[PDB]
PDB file of C-alpha atoms in Angstrom:
ATOM      1  CA  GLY A   1       9.418 -53.648  -7.710  1.00 20.19           C
ATOM      2  CA  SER A   2       8.114 -56.818  -9.031  1.00 18.96           C
ATOM      3  CA  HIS A   3       7.059 -59.692 -10.233  1.00 20.41           C
ATOM      4  CA  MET A   4       4.579 -59.067 -14.175  1.00 21.57           C
ATOM      5  CA  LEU A   5       2.590 -55.909 -13.662  1.00 21.85           C
ATOM      6  CA  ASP A   6       0.958 -56.106  -9.718  1.00 25.41           C
ATOM      7  CA  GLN A   7      -2.567 -54.959  -8.433  1.00 23.15           C
ATOM      8  CA  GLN A   8      -3.115 -53.012  -6.229  1.00 23.81           C
ATOM      9  CA  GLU A   9      -5.382 -49.445  -6.062  1.00 23.59           C
ATOM     10  CA  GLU A  10      -6.913 -47.862  -8.915  1.00 26.31           C
ATOM     11  CA  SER A  11      -6.221 -44.186  -9.632  1.00 27.73           C
ATOM     12  CA  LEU A  12      -7.396 -41.153  -9.559  1.00 25.28           C
ATOM     13  CA  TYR A  13     -10.847 -40.305  -9.848  1.00 26.81           C
ATOM     14  CA  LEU A  14     -12.921 -36.921 -10.839  1.00 29.46           C
ATOM     15  CA  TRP A  15     -16.983 -36.230 -10.485  1.00 29.33           C
ATOM     16  CA  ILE A  16     -19.255 -33.327 -10.181  1.00 26.31           C
ATOM     17  CA  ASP A  17     -21.967 -34.467  -7.943  1.00 29.31           C
ATOM     18  CA  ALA A  18     -25.319 -34.333  -8.254  1.00 28.81           C
ATOM     19  CA  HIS A  19     -26.297 -32.542  -4.998  1.00 31.88           C
ATOM     20  CA  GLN A  20     -24.551 -29.201  -6.571  1.00 31.49           C
ATOM     21  CA  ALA A  21     -27.024 -30.277 -10.256  1.00 30.17           C
ATOM     22  CA  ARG A  22     -30.418 -30.597  -7.164  1.00 31.62           C
ATOM     23  CA  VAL A  23     -29.865 -26.351  -6.183  1.00 35.13           C
ATOM     24  CA  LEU A  24     -29.856 -26.063 -10.082  1.00 35.94           C
ATOM     25  CA  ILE A  25     -33.302 -27.623 -10.546  1.00 36.05           C
ATOM     26  CA  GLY A  26     -34.164 -29.834  -7.722  1.00 38.85           C
ATOM     27  CA  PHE A  27     -33.288 -32.995 -10.439  1.00 34.70           C
ATOM     28  CA  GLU A  28     -30.237 -34.668  -8.947  1.00 36.94           C
ATOM     29  CA  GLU A  29     -27.639 -35.233 -12.014  1.00 33.85           C
ATOM     30  CA  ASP A  30     -23.728 -36.152 -11.266  1.00 33.07           C
ATOM     31  CA  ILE A  31     -21.509 -35.988 -13.999  1.00 35.63           C
ATOM     32  CA  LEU A  32     -17.838 -38.748 -14.107  1.00 35.07           C
ATOM     33  CA  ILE A  33     -15.175 -37.122 -15.445  1.00 30.17           C
ATOM     34  CA  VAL A  34     -11.927 -38.788 -14.717  1.00 29.13           C
ATOM     35  CA  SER A  35     -12.067 -42.563 -13.900  1.00 28.18           C
ATOM     36  CA  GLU A  36      -9.311 -44.640 -12.832  1.00 29.65           C
ATOM     37  CA  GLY A  37      -7.286 -41.591 -15.144  1.00 32.46           C
ATOM     38  CA  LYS A  38      -9.254 -43.394 -17.910  1.00 32.38           C
ATOM     39  CA  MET A  39     -11.416 -40.371 -18.850  1.00 30.47           C
ATOM     40  CA  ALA A  40     -13.803 -40.075 -20.957  1.00 32.39           C
ATOM     41  CA  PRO A  41     -14.377 -38.420 -23.775  1.00 31.30           C
ATOM     42  CA  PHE A  42     -16.627 -36.200 -20.630  1.00 28.51           C
ATOM     43  CA  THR A  43     -15.158 -32.523 -23.104  1.00 27.72           C
ATOM     44  CA  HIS A  44     -17.769 -32.762 -25.614  1.00 27.60           C
ATOM     45  CA  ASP A  45     -20.987 -32.903 -23.646  1.00 27.37           C
ATOM     46  CA  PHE A  46     -19.056 -30.272 -21.322  1.00 28.20           C
ATOM     47  CA  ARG A  47     -19.158 -27.871 -23.776  1.00 30.33           C
ATOM     48  CA  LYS A  48     -21.295 -29.218 -26.044  1.00 28.73           C
ATOM     49  CA  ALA A  49     -24.985 -28.172 -24.836  1.00 29.45           C
ATOM     50  CA  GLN A  50     -25.528 -30.433 -21.924  1.00 27.77           C
ATOM     51  CA  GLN A  51     -28.805 -30.046 -19.581  1.00 25.87           C
ATOM     52  CA  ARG A  52     -26.793 -29.113 -16.796  1.00 24.54           C
ATOM     53  CA  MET A  53     -22.400 -28.238 -17.548  1.00 24.47           C
ATOM     54  CA  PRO A  54     -22.968 -25.192 -19.246  1.00 25.03           C
ATOM     55  CA  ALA A  55     -25.617 -22.740 -19.064  1.00 23.71           C
ATOM     56  CA  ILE A  56     -25.559 -21.742 -14.972  1.00 26.99           C
ATOM     57  CA  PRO A  57     -27.830 -19.834 -13.426  1.00 26.54           C
ATOM     58  CA  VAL A  58     -26.986 -16.290 -11.371  1.00 24.76           C
ATOM     59  CA  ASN A  59     -28.722 -17.742  -8.395  1.00 25.08           C
ATOM     60  CA  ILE A  60     -26.447 -20.660  -8.176  1.00 24.33           C
ATOM     61  CA  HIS A  61     -23.272 -18.977  -6.412  1.00 25.04           C
ATOM     62  CA  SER A  62     -21.098 -22.110  -6.216  1.00 23.37           C
ATOM     63  CA  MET A  63     -20.833 -25.649  -8.106  1.00 22.13           C
ATOM     64  CA  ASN A  64     -19.720 -28.241  -6.375  1.00 22.54           C
ATOM     65  CA  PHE A  65     -17.141 -30.838  -8.240  1.00 26.27           C
ATOM     66  CA  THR A  66     -15.600 -34.415  -5.850  1.00 23.52           C
ATOM     67  CA  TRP A  67     -12.181 -36.095  -6.540  1.00 24.19           C
ATOM     68  CA  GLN A  68     -10.503 -38.534  -5.397  1.00 25.07           C
ATOM     69  CA  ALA A  69      -7.104 -41.235  -5.374  1.00 26.33           C
ATOM     70  CA  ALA A  70      -7.803 -44.715  -4.757  1.00 25.62           C
ATOM     71  CA  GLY A  71      -6.082 -46.032  -0.572  1.00 28.59           C
ATOM     72  CA  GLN A  72      -2.440 -45.041  -1.118  1.00 27.82           C
ATOM     73  CA  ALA A  73      -1.943 -43.706  -4.775  1.00 27.31           C
ATOM     74  CA  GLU A  74      -2.276 -39.756  -3.919  1.00 22.90           C
ATOM     75  CA  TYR A  75      -2.107 -38.028  -7.353  1.00 23.33           C
ATOM     76  CA  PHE A  76      -0.671 -33.919  -6.992  1.00 22.67           C
ATOM     77  CA  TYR A  77      -2.546 -31.274  -8.874  1.00 19.85           C
ATOM     78  CA  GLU A  78      -2.609 -27.690  -9.925  1.00 16.71           C
ATOM     79  CA  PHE A  79      -4.627 -25.269 -12.090  1.00 19.66           C
ATOM     80  CA  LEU A  80      -4.117 -24.304 -15.366  1.00 17.66           C
ATOM     81  CA  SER A  81      -6.658 -22.450 -16.334  1.00 18.17           C
ATOM     82  CA  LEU A  82      -9.857 -21.421 -13.734  1.00 17.87           C
ATOM     83  CA  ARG A  83     -10.430 -17.475 -15.307  1.00 15.38           C
ATOM     84  CA  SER A  84     -12.897 -15.494 -16.714  1.00 17.63           C
ATOM     85  CA  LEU A  85     -13.477 -15.079 -20.073  1.00 15.43           C
ATOM     86  CA  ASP A  86     -16.079 -12.382 -20.556  1.00 12.73           C
ATOM     87  CA  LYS A  87     -16.195  -8.326 -20.496  1.00 13.38           C
ATOM     88  CA  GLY A  88     -19.608  -7.374 -19.577  1.00 11.99           C
ATOM     89  CA  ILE A  89     -21.119 -10.406 -17.776  1.00 14.95           C
ATOM     90  CA  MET A  90     -17.846 -10.432 -16.429  1.00 14.27           C
ATOM     91  CA  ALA A  91     -17.022 -12.386 -13.043  1.00 12.72           C
ATOM     92  CA  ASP A  92     -14.197 -13.954 -11.928  1.00 11.79           C
ATOM     93  CA  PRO A  93     -14.397 -18.197 -10.638  1.00 12.70           C
ATOM     94  CA  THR A  94     -12.629 -19.287  -7.465  1.00 13.61           C
ATOM     95  CA  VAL A  95     -11.752 -22.460  -5.606  1.00 15.21           C
ATOM     96  CA  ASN A  96     -12.276 -24.435  -1.975  1.00 16.93           C
ATOM     97  CA  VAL A  97      -9.124 -25.068  -2.334  1.00 19.69           C
ATOM     98  CA  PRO A  98      -4.940 -23.855  -2.768  1.00 20.81           C
ATOM     99  CA  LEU A  99      -4.046 -23.672  -7.021  1.00 20.64           C
ATOM    100  CA  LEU A 100      -1.965 -26.689  -6.268  1.00 19.94           C
ATOM    101  CA  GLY A 101      -2.655 -30.260  -3.986  1.00 18.74           C
ATOM    102  CA  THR A 102      -3.423 -33.086  -3.928  1.00 17.50           C
ATOM    103  CA  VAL A 103      -6.175 -35.473  -5.029  1.00 17.23           C
ATOM    104  CA  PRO A 104      -6.057 -37.282  -1.920  1.00 15.57           C
ATOM    105  CA  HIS A 105      -8.391 -41.449  -1.507  1.00 10.45           C
ATOM    106  CA  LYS A 106     -10.940 -39.320   0.943  1.00 10.36           C
ATOM    107  CA  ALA A 107     -13.865 -38.170  -1.767  1.00 10.95           C
ATOM    108  CA  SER A 108     -13.382 -34.835  -0.862  1.00 13.29           C
ATOM    109  CA  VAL A 109     -16.112 -32.271  -2.626  1.00 13.18           C
ATOM    110  CA  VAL A 110     -14.469 -29.177  -3.972  1.00 11.75           C
ATOM    111  CA  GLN A 111     -16.493 -25.956  -4.116  1.00 13.12           C
ATOM    112  CA  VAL A 112     -15.992 -23.535  -7.259  1.00 13.29           C
ATOM    113  CA  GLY A 113     -17.145 -20.459  -6.004  1.00 14.41           C
ATOM    114  CA  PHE A 114     -18.318 -18.240  -9.130  1.00 17.83           C
ATOM    115  CA  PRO A 115     -18.928 -14.091  -7.542  1.00 18.81           C
ATOM    116  CA  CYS A 116     -20.079 -12.101 -10.251  1.00 18.45           C
ATOM    117  CA  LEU A 117     -19.536  -8.372 -11.478  1.00 16.10           C
ATOM    118  CA  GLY A 118     -23.208  -8.146 -11.969  1.00 16.43           C
ATOM    119  CA  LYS A 119     -22.289  -5.143 -14.444  1.00 15.88           C
ATOM    120  CA  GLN A 120     -24.161  -6.052 -17.748  1.00 17.44           C
ATOM    121  CA  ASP A 121     -27.194  -9.254 -18.479  1.00 18.08           C
ATOM    122  CA  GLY A 122     -26.429 -11.830 -20.093  1.00 14.25           C
ATOM    123  CA  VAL A 123     -24.495 -15.161 -20.056  1.00 17.83           C
ATOM    124  CA  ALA A 124     -20.949 -14.799 -19.149  1.00 12.46           C
ATOM    125  CA  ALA A 125     -18.046 -17.740 -19.961  1.00 13.31           C
ATOM    126  CA  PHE A 126     -15.247 -18.997 -17.618  1.00 11.73           C
ATOM    127  CA  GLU A 127     -12.607 -21.783 -18.639  1.00 11.97           C
ATOM    128  CA  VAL A 128     -10.505 -24.291 -16.748  1.00 11.08           C
ATOM    129  CA  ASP A 129      -8.181 -26.817 -17.003  1.00 11.54           C
ATOM    130  CA  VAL A 130      -6.002 -29.061 -14.237  1.00 12.38           C
ATOM    131  CA  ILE A 131      -2.587 -31.122 -15.186  1.00 13.32           C
ATOM    132  CA  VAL A 132      -1.662 -34.108 -12.047  1.00 12.66           C
ATOM    133  CA  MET A 133       1.689 -35.215 -11.723  1.00 16.38           C
ATOM    134  CA  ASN A 134       3.161 -37.565  -9.056  1.00 19.17           C
ATOM    135  CA  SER A 135       4.441 -35.759  -5.841  1.00 16.38           C
ATOM    136  CA  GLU A 136       8.039 -35.508  -7.873  1.00 18.26           C
ATOM    137  CA  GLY A 137       6.356 -33.102 -10.238  1.00 17.39           C
ATOM    138  CA  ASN A 138       6.645 -36.095 -13.176  1.00 17.08           C
ATOM    139  CA  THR A 139       3.310 -35.152 -14.635  1.00 14.65           C
ATOM    140  CA  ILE A 140       0.278 -38.259 -15.558  1.00 14.32           C
ATOM    141  CA  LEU A 141      -2.973 -36.285 -15.712  1.00 16.69           C
ATOM    142  CA  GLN A 142      -4.477 -33.966 -17.726  1.00 14.59           C
ATOM    143  CA  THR A 143      -8.125 -32.111 -18.633  1.00 11.24           C
ATOM    144  CA  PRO A 144      -8.174 -31.931 -21.836  1.00  8.63           C
ATOM    145  CA  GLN A 145      -8.129 -28.288 -23.124  1.00  8.16           C
ATOM    146  CA  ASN A 146     -12.158 -27.196 -23.706  1.00  8.63           C
ATOM    147  CA  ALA A 147     -13.610 -27.293 -20.271  1.00  9.42           C
ATOM    148  CA  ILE A 148     -15.606 -24.165 -20.341  1.00 12.26           C
ATOM    149  CA  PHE A 149     -18.470 -23.369 -18.352  1.00  9.84           C
ATOM    150  CA  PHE A 150     -21.104 -20.393 -19.103  1.00 13.63           C
ATOM    151  CA  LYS A 151     -22.429 -18.710 -15.520  1.00 12.75           C
ATOM    152  CA  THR A 152     -25.713 -16.616 -16.765  1.00 11.98           C
ATOM    153  CA  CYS A 153     -25.937 -12.909 -14.565  1.00 13.94           C
ATOM    154  CA  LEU A 154     -28.023 -10.066 -14.612  1.00 16.88           C
ATOM    155  CA  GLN A 155     -27.053  -6.783 -14.067  1.00 16.10           C
ATOM    156  CA  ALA A 156     -26.732  -5.535  -9.704  1.00 17.49           C
ATOM    157  CA  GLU A 157     -24.907  -2.205  -7.736  1.00 20.75           C
TER     158      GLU A 157
END
């Protein structure tokens, strides 16, 4: 509470970390989603056929995502959407964290697990959308609705 606009630490960062992409094709590819809350138009590429984001093979059980705040700025998050969309190639996506929480200044990994029901062979889809608020509950950052992935399963029972 202050002079004209001060200079303090940055806003929320969220990227899909490259370590996971190695497990996808032995090649390493990061994808920056949210940089200082100033989110890139990443959602076009995310839902478009990208080299690495949509199509996931049966072999990948889980993906990783990585996020953080800057120094004193812990953002609060809550998962609006995280669910499958298929019928035959049906699965249920899961997260390595609670459905709500905070984004910490500490670069922290969030695994996303994809147990498939192993019934029909093909490619199922799943939706994700997450909102972000300050600790009082005031919404401030919101994922745009299009973040959909595609997980290739085969029959196994």
